[model samples]
Target: GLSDGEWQQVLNVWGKVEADIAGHGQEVLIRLFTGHPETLEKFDKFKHLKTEAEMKASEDLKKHGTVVLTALGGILKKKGHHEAELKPLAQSHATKHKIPIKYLEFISDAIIHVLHSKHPGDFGADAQGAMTKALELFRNDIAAKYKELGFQG
Candidate 1:
């Protein structure tokens, strides 16, 4: 549900950060796990990463983060045409991983924070606002599909 200008802003900002996807992704995961330690319980591999250093040292974290960042890139490329792509992932997360939607909400905030910190100039208020709303829409779409899957925690 992003306006044309907002979509352009997202792509422009994504262009700036895509080159360092691994690093930015790692930071996002670290931020999420650090801010909500209990969320780590869902990932057996990442649950033990009690410190930033430990998290940075974790290949699992790096891989997962990179995957998420890459997925975000794809979502941005679709320019709001994300429901098809998001639904399957949401079903998997809901049914298999059992990740609560709350964790996804945390990741959305973490991603916004990372974007603002990593590209302070590029991610101005307008860009940040666009990204925040975009993430919210993404999460809502995923959550809706998750609900349809009939799994609850």
Candidate 2:
């Protein structure tokens, strides 16, 4: 349900995260909703991700109907990962829903503050505050993008 521009922005963020993984050799993965039977086949790529990624948590999410996996940061991003990532939701028949942006923003700030208050050193207080503010901004943007689509956050 994301608008074209919203979709692009999501991809931009995803690209940045994916680039970090590729350059630093960090592992990154994604999951898509396969709630519809007709679309169930689309999940083929994610079927054995637990075995492939060695992540029992992911396997559990899938089995429990909480998630679907996509080992996407590598070649997937290079080949347009955004399209693949959003396909499920965009193509779904679900009713559009909305989320409270303020709630997400609050959580982002709260997490930053908590982390800073705890570590305080290598994770400088000011740095943590800034990071949290940045995360809030990101969340705000998402809230706006998904506002029309009734995106559940």
TM-score: which candidate is best? 1
In the range 1-153, model 2's lDDT, one tens digit per residue, is 343444444344444443333321112122122222222233454445534344334544334332211232222232333444444333342233222444444434443443444445545444444444445444444554566567654
> In terms of TM-score, how similar is model 1 to the real structure?
0.92
Name the candidate that leads on lDDT: 1
* Candidate 1 local lDDT, 1-153, one digit each (tens): 889999888788787668888889999999998999888888887777778899989888888888988987898788878878888889889988988888889999998888878877777898888888788888888878877887665
RMSD of candidate 1 to true structure, Å: 1.4
lDDT of 2: 0.38
C-alpha lDDT score of every prediction, in listed order? 0.84, 0.38
In angstroms, give how far residue 103 of model 2 lies from its true place.
0.7
Each model's TM-score?
A: 0.92, 0.33
